[PDB]
Amino acid sequence: EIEVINDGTMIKFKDVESYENALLKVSAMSTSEQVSFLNSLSFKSQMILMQEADGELDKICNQAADKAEFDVLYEKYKHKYGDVFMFNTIDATDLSPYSRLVYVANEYFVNMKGEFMIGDSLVVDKVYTDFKERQQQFTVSTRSSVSDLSSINEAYSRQKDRKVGLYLSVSSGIIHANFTSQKKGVFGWSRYSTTYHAKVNLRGFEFAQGELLGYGPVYVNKDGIPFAIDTKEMGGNVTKVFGRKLAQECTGTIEIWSRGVPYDQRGFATVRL
Amino acid sequence: EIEVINDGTMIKFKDVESYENALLKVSAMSTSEQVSFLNSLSFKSQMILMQEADGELDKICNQAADKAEFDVLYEKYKHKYGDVFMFNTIDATDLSPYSRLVYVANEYFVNMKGEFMIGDSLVVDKVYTDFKERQQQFTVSTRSSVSDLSSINEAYSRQKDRKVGLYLSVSSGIIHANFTSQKKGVFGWSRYSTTYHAKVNLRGFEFAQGELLGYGPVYVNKDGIPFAIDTKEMGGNVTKVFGRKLAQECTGTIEIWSRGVPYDQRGFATVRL
Ligand SMILES: [Cl-]
Ligand SMILES: [Cl-]
Ligand SMILES: [Cl-]
Ligand SMILES: [Cl-]
Ligand SMILES: [Cl-]
Ligand SMILES: [Cl-]
Ligand SMILES: [Cl-]
Ligand SMILES: [Cl-]
Ligand SMILES: [Cl-]
Ligand SMILES: [Cl-]
CATH class of the missing domain: 2.60.40.3900 (Immunoglobulin-like)
Structure with a gap:
């Protein structure tokens, strides 16, 4: 069983077996199937935020008339996503936000603080300290x-x-x-x-x-x-x-x-x- | 005029005009034409040594049965050429010797100490301190x-x-x-x-x-x-x-x-x- 608790701000699994099974079944679905299965649970995970973040970056590149206008838009964008997500510190031409997660597929179940629960145990999922640690x-x-x-x-x-x-x-x-x-x-x-x-x-x-x-x-x-x-x-x-x-x-x-x-x-x- | 002095150990040019002209005419020739024009002058330049060095590296790769045998051959090779020439300090899989010269085409006229003369003036041609300075x-x-x-x-x-x-x-x-x-x-x-x-x-x-x-x-x-x-x-x-x-x-x-x-x-x- 999968349970959404703390007023839709936490995913709770029954045990390790439930979690590993739900991770396999959900990670094997299509993006639309995953987005709909998460909508079924009335839970916004880091994955739904990544969909939104990516959609919003693509829209910023389409509405920007010039570099100076993009720079204004993109500063507001980074401020918005730069806490849950991480930006590229090596190549500044790489505009995309990144997951801080080491165990990437957990994005489907982690909340806005990178948390999920196994029964009464709270998992604050493993993150990268900086972008350089990911590409290291x-x-x-x-x-x-x-x-x-x-x-x-x-x-x-x-x-x-x-x-x-x-x-x-x-x-x-x-x-x-x-x-x-x-x-x-x-x-x-x-x-x-x-x-x-x-x-x-x-x-x-x-x-x-x-x-x-x-x-x-x-x-x-x-x-x-x-x-x-x-x-x-x-x-x-x-x-x-x-x-x-x-x-x-x-x-x-x-x-x-x-x-x-x-x-x-x-x-x-x-x-x- | 081009003059070979100090018992075939130094190229002397009449003036700057002679040198720049000889550099253009010689650098426009084919490798064989250059090797023969230098043989005409009974002068071994850094270029002739590079021909020899490259020929000898290709022969070492052909006679070596295994890595340990190559390593023995290649250590003797480096010792032989590692003073006039420079080896790659960044990539150790790059076996080739390199000119220390910044002004590369001067290889045709520089001797074993990287020298040539303009009348009574001695030119100790500009060299790289290390290989890293060349790729910097x-x-x-x-x-x-x-x-x-x-x-x-x-x-x-x-x-x-x-x-x-x-x-x-x-x-x-x-x-x-x-x-x-x-x-x-x-x-x-x-x-x-x-x-x-x-x-x-x-x-x-x-x-x-x-x-x-x-x-x-x-x-x-x-x-x-x-x-x-x-x-x-x-x-x-x-x-x-x-x-x-x-x-x-x-x-x-x-x-x-x-x-x-x-x-x-x-x-x-x-x-x-
Ligand atoms: Cl609740
Ligand atoms: Cl496949
Ligand atoms: Cl494509
Ligand atoms: Cl380019
Ligand atoms: Cl493991
Ligand atoms: Cl002489
Ligand atoms: Cl051409
Ligand atoms: Cl080829
Ligand atoms: Cl490879
Ligand atoms: Cl200049």
Whole structure:
């Protein structure tokens, strides 16, 4: 038996067996079935609040005309849900509220204080102290990592058994590029030959164009001119004069992929030279 | 003019113009053309050493019968190249030596001490203090991150505009699962409905099988039995009784992907419950 006590503010189970059984039966239902089974019991659990919280976040993203308006709405939203729920302290672009619960499926029966009862025993369910405790791990290593536009002068894409990079530096107006590629073997990562592919869009820039039809290498103006680099097969450590600076600042973006790293998985970087 | 002095141990350029020109012309050549142009000058540069270092690492991976033998070979290799070159201090599976040079294309002309000359001026080229200084960045954010088998009880795949996760925890033998999914909007990440896909291979495990043909939910033995989970469309925060422990330890692996995150980009995790 499931009993709603303390004027619809507490779920009480007969014993451990009743609780574990109700958890299995309720967690196996569809969201609508769960919402209706809880409506049957006239009990608002943390799960019903999560439905509401998620519904309200989706509506805030739809009514907000601009960032400043969203910021006003979202501050009120966080204040509203930021006590029962927890927000992402690592990535501030992740807007969603989170359960504080370690034993996640208990969300169906815990109340607004994270409580439920087994007979005369009160269970204050196990919670995370902070969001960082939930995502905490001893590892630094990942299967895959691809750089975004917040990476400065360094673009990479490390996949499961192939890596590619484009590293930029500048000495007296001369821009140096390092094209890199590795393959995962039985003993680890080692350099291997590949074809490099880049998409360069830079301001105040001259490209060090390679020899073509017996003309060049020559500095070709690419000031705000997007262009592509599709090399021939080369080693895993290629060093090149990438170009020169025409102005005080050389800004823009770079994208890098290879024969082994597909365009979809290309690495990005903002250029500041 | 390019002049090899101090009995083939130093490259001397006439002026800055000669150096910048030779750097452009040499960096635009093919690897073989560069190796031959340097052989023409009877000068061994850091570039020729990198060719040798890379060639020797590839040969060590081919002659090593096992890890312990490689370890003996690779210790001697590191000692040999670990002064002129730099090894990866962050990822120990990355075996390759690295240039200490900031201005990478200078590898063609720098000697074994990272030197070259402009007339009577000696240039001790700019180097990185440590490997960490080369990979150093202020950002924590990436475009893409996928967990590997070193991630314990948490598998994820965060792509450019879609995320998926499978988080496991255990309370008194009852295993709790959290299936998560987010989409990137104009204001950031928010929850959205998707179809989840998992590949589970666990020891000492009973799966909490959902209702099928009016039978269950029921605990089905999956002790060392690989099996798949292909859900129907569900929200971005699904909580489930995943199963139960049959023994003292529940170990194995989990793989997670979704309708938005393709199988290729599926996240991994080792399970220890
Ligand atoms: Cl009452
Ligand atoms: Cl990006
Ligand atoms: Cl400069
Ligand atoms: Cl090209
Ligand atoms: Cl390849
Ligand atoms: Cl001499
Ligand atoms: Cl992996
Ligand atoms: Cl346990
Ligand atoms: Cl299934
Ligand atoms: Cl989708």
